[PDB]
Paper text:
The HIV-1 envelope glycoprotein (Env) is the sole target for neutralizing antibody (NAb) responses. The development and structural determination of soluble native-like Env trimer mimics, particularly ones based on the SOSIP technology, has provided a platform for structure-based immunogen design. Here, we describe a detailed characterization of neutralizing and non-neutralizing mAbs isolated from two rhesus macaques (RMs) previously immunized with the BG505 SOSIP.664 trimer. We therefore selected three Fabs (RM20J, RM20F, and RM20E1) that bound to different epitopes for high-resolution structural determination.
Numbering used by the authors:
A (entry chain L): 1 to 214
B (entry chain H): 1 to 222
The structure:
């Protein structure tokens, strides 16, 4: 299978800007490369085919170029309806494959997240499961990494994350990370910590609590 | 012009068969085009499932799915269709039908969400996310509600019957490995208001006809 990658994961832009996003193919695909736009809740819409051809009914402020392994989508004089997700797609060979997507953002100044951690509530603990919650509030840009550590042992595969859309009034994001353990395993450990990596932080920040200490 | 519309069930029990149909208008299903199924799982890139070509009948399949997948056309209804057997939780996604024409997908359906879960309708448990005593030190307190183990979507959350809107973030729901949904709703307030203002989340889950109000109480050490 041909692997498509895209850069950046999200791009900060303002109305009227000219922005360029990048696509890379793991092999030479010549010019069998298309670009699509997707808005929230809607199906993708084709924008560019053969790396450079404007699809019918698409504004000419969309252009693209490239051959072989590296491709660009450029939007000149960006309009409000252009804040959306953008995907590339190769058709050089079966296993038609898409890139992970680039999200075009409303630009604002960098804002580090405020981090808060919540132990499971008393009532849930009576139930028989434990949910530990880590909130990252009001940050920008969108890329954030959350790692769970239980008594300094890095967790994996027992957490889920959720992110809001870009806030309509201040242009920030928020994220929740929920670590799920059984009650019996939760009661075998002391220190619950989430560690947050983000561009607005000089170094990863930790928020933790000790079980049974107020 | 050319229009595609998906239809199919919203919930498939694990290991049952997922069946979908795309009805095509404005063009013949026997045209030399690639009638394609593509899906998008929560937080994942679009994934090409496969296609059938209208005129030749040639079918192209994703290798890992080939034992489970059949794609076909029906000329009497001008449709094409997708069957995928032995369905697991990895198969929950929005499914799109689309037309491949030479160099892009130039027409698309609307998408249909298909969820794999053996759950029946069930109202949520609602747990407080109270601010720790320590966490209030900077002058802002984060508090919230965890609404857990419900089915199906959606739930609504308000704070103090809708008098509190500033600083509220209600997160999109996530499907847990159990097949039940969970979300959280949070709000930041001033620390000094924790002793004066009362904070209650109101959760409504109409499919189960459940209304829960949860008082979120500040923690105290002494």
């Amino acid at each position: 299978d041909i692997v498509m990658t895209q850069s950046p994961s999200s791009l900060s832009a303002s109305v009227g800007d000219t922005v360029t996003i990048t696509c890379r193919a793991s092999q030479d695909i010549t010019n069998d490369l298309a670009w699509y736009q997707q808005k929230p809740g809607k199906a993708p819409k084709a924008l560019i085919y053969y790396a450079s051809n404007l699809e019918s009914g698409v504004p000419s402020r969309f252009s693209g170029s490239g051959a072989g392994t590296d491709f660009t989508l450029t939007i000149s004089s960006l309009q409000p309806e252009d804040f959306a997700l953008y995907y590339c797609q190769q058709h050089n060979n079966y296993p038609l494959t898409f890139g992970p997507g680039t999200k075009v953002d409303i630009k604002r100044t960098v804002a580090a997240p405020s981090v808060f951690i919540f132990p499971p509530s008393d009532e849930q603990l009576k139930s028989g499961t434990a949910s530990v919650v880590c909130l990252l509030n009001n940050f920008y840009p969108r890329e954030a990494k959350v790692q769970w550590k239980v008594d300094n042992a890095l967790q994996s595969g027992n957490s889920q994350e959720s992110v809001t859309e870009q806030d309509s009034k201040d242009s920030t994001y928020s994220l929740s990370s929920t670590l799920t353990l059984s009650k019996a395993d939760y009661e075998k450990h002391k220190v619950y910590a989430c560690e947050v990596t983000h561009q607005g932080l000089s170094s990863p920040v930790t928020k933790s609590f000790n079980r049974g200490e107020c | 012009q050319v229009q595609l519309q998906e239809s199919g069930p919203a919930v498939v029990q694990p290991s049952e068969t997922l069946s979908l149909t795309c009805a095509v208008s404005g063009g013949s299903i026997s045209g030399g085009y690639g009638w394609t199924w593509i899906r998008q799982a929560p937080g994942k890139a679009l994934e090409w499932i496969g296609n059938i070509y209208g005129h030749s009948g040639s079918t192209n399949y994703k290798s890992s799915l080939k034992r489970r997948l059949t794609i076909s056309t029906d000329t009497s209804k001008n449709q094409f269709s997708l069957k995928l057997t032995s369905v697991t939780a990895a198969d929950t996604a929005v499914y799109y039908c689309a037309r491949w024409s030479t160099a892009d997908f130039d027409y698309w359906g609307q998408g249909v969400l298909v969820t794999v879960s053996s759950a029946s309708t069930k109202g949520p448990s609602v747990f407080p996310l109270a601010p720790s005593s320590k966490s209030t030190s900077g002058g802002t307190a984060a508090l919230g509600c965890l609404v857990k183990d419900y089915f199906p979507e959606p739930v609504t959350v308000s704070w103090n019957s809708g008098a509190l809107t500033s600083g509220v973030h209600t997160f999109p729901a996530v499907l847990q490995s159990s097949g039940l949904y969970s979300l959280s709703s949070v709000v930041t307030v001033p620390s000094s208001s924790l002793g004066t203002q009362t904070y209650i989340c109101n959760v409504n889950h109409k499919p189960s006809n459940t209304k829960v109000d949860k008082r979120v109480e500040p923690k105290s050490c002494d």
